[PDB]
């Protein structure tokens, strides 16, 4: 990955990326994109020097995006869920969908609908945890029940054993770096096995995934530009548009629009989908519209805290008004409400930013800038 | 409708690993004693113990976190250090001293000062140790220490900032080491035969010095 090249190169304390004399130079555009993406992960600072998080990424051998989740996962014993997640995306999708099954027989399609339903319990609006559901469920399937479990759920078996092996090695990598006994850690199956994540753990789990794909966050069009596209209750979920954060504003805003995939859990929702959705990537597949590979839904304040580390988030001046006094401690310390802005700056009309809900937060003047510390 | 209407955020492994320098690297290892005190209570003090113990166990069991009980069969108060609750190693001894002060004759609230602080001691001595007084001579000495209506004893208590229990010819003084000492000379001076009035004058002098410092 071009981000790993710059990341390893920056951990080498090498300042000039763009003009470096590579024997085989990567194109300047990707090198620039890598720096911005690697900044979005909070590993480079605003002057493009490696931070403490970035140095840990240099130690991790995976892609810098998958470097980020594991590092920030060391809280509330949610690691096995993240490891189970990261293994699934790394290998691929274990779900044989209805279109692949050619069932888009009425009794067979109906079994396919239940099989998805049992794995849908973790979260209504999210697909990445349905991946978690099968991976964790696989651990409790005995050896003699695999193929029956495989055939019953329309899942790919040989892919599944891969996930279990990938979970094993991956846990060793993060434990080695995070744990003080780096080399001495030995992985065990019991560690991988775990029970249902709690609601707080689920929310804790959605925001960890955001730490990786903070750039890949999409807003409903009806939020950012009311009436730009006609949205109403009768519209199906797959036809509800969304806009990426860093999409360049076209003369016609419909070009930037991106839509949910039918296979996603959100399609069978019926109710209105999330105002923000987190997507692994976008796919031109499907002549009608560009589709999402959606992972999980994030709220306003959760998104703000994740992009707080990154440079994709900007804060306004202190708010004043009814019950909005800005408490001040020192010349370089204060407590007030601020409306965070995620994405492009208001001045920057090329890229498409938006404003988040106002939240209590702590700032300190560093280098003449009220750097944010923590949300109150 | 009213008719007035309008219109939260973010087993030891049995093996070793050898590192590049050849060193071994192992896994992390897996991640107040019971004591008792006996103090017997004499007969004359137990009725005070009965009606007062409603205020004696709470500080011991709560603040000192001691395990309290008494033996009716042996007529003794018992305190034990509970290993799973007790935290202060000195609490058990501290509780014993507080019980002892009540046993010697001090008031309960007076004895609580032993629990509240760590620097209170009981000084004890006897009249014949000062001077061999017998018959009426001994009785007059005891009266001189107490004074009319106990005024002389209270004068010493307030001036030297201590307490005195005058049990017949048996004297106990409770307070800080220097404070209890100051009381002794005033008591002893009375035993040797100093009139109470002259003694009272010296109490006023030392009391002023106490306030100054």
């Amino acid at each position: 990955p071009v981000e790993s090249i710059v990341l390893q190169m920056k951990s080498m304390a090498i300042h000039n990326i763009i003009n470096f004399p590579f024997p085989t130079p990567p194109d300047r555009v990707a090198l620039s994109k890598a720096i911005q993406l690697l900044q979005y992960l909070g590993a480079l600072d605003n002057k493009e020097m490696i931070t403490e998080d970035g140095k840990k990424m240099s130690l991790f051998p995976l892609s810098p995006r998958f470097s980020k989740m594991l590092l920030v996962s060391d809280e509330k014993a949610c690691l096995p869920y993240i490891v189970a997640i990261v293994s699934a995306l790394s290998v691929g999708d274990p779900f044989i969908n209805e279109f692949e099954l050619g069932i888009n027989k009425k009794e067979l399609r109906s079994k396919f609908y239940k099989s998805r339903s049992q794995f849908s319990k973790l979260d209504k609006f999210s697909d990445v945890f349905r991946l978690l559901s099968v991976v964790s469920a696989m651990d409790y399937v005995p050896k003699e029940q695999k193929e029956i479990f495989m055939k019953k759920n329309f899942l790919r078996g040989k892919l599944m054993e891969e996930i279990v092996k990938l979970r094993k090695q991956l846990m060793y990598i993060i434990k080695s770096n995070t744990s003080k006994e780096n080399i001495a850690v030995v992985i065990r199956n019991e560690d991988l096995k775990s029970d249902i994540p709690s609601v707080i753990q689920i929310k804790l789990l959605k925001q960890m995934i955001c730490a990786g794909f903070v750039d890949h966050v999409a807003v409903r069009a009806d939020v950012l530009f009311p009436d730009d596209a006609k949205i109403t209750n009768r519209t199906s979920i797959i036809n509800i548009p969304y806009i990426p954060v860093l999409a360049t504003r076209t003369p016609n805003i419909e070009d930037c629009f991106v839509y949910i995939h039918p296979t996603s859990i959100l399609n069978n929702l019926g109710e209105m989908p999330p105002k923000y959705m987190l997507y692994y990537s976008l796919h031109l597949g499907g002549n009608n519209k560009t589709r999402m590979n959606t992972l999980c839904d994030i709220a306003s304040t959760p998104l703000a805290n994740i992009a707080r580390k990154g440079l994709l988030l900007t804060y306004s001046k202190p708010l004043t008004g009814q019950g909005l006094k800005t408490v001040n401690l020192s010349p370089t310390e204060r407590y007030c409400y601020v409306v965070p802005r995620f994405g492009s700056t208001v001045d920057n009309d090329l890229k498409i930013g938006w404003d988040l809900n106002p939240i209590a937060v702590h700032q300190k003047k560093q280098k003449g800038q009220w750097t944010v510390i923590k949300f109150i | 409708v009213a008719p007035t209407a309008l219109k939260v955020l973010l087993h030891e492994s049995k093996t070793v690993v050898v590192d590049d320098q050849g060193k071994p690297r192992f896994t992390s290892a897996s991640k107040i004693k019971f004591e008792s005190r006996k103090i017997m209570v004499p007969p004359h003090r137990m009725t005070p113990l009965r009606n007062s113990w409603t205020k004696i166990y709470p500080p011991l069991v709560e603040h000192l976190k001691l395990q309290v009980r008494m033996n009716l069969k042996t007529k003794s108060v018992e305190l034990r250090t509970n290993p799973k609750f007790t935290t202060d190693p000195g609490a058990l001894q501290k509780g014993a001293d507080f019980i002892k002060a009540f046993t010697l004759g001090f008031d309960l609230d007076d004895s609580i000062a032993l629990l509240r602080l760590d620097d209170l001691y009981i000084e004890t001595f006897e009249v014949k140790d000062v001077k061999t007084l017998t018959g009426d001579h001994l009785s007059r000495a005891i009266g001189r220490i107490a004074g009319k209506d106990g005024k002389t004893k209270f004068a010493i208590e307030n001036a030297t900032r201590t307490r005195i229990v005058l049990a017949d010819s048996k004297i106990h003084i409770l307070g800080g080491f220097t404070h209890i000492r100051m009381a002794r000379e005033s008591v002893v001076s009375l035993i040797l035969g100093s009139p109470p009035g002259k003694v009272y004058g010296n109490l006023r002098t030392v009391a002023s010095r106490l306030k100054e410092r």
């Binding site: 469920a137 409790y140 029970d195 249902i196 | 113990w53 309290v68 009980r69 009716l72």
Partner: peptide, 13 residues
């Protein structure tokens, strides 16, 4: 699986 009286008069107190 899911994925699929005076205190202490005579006694210790």
């Amino acid at each position: 699986n899911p994925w699929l009286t005076l205190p202490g008069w005579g006694e210790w107190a």
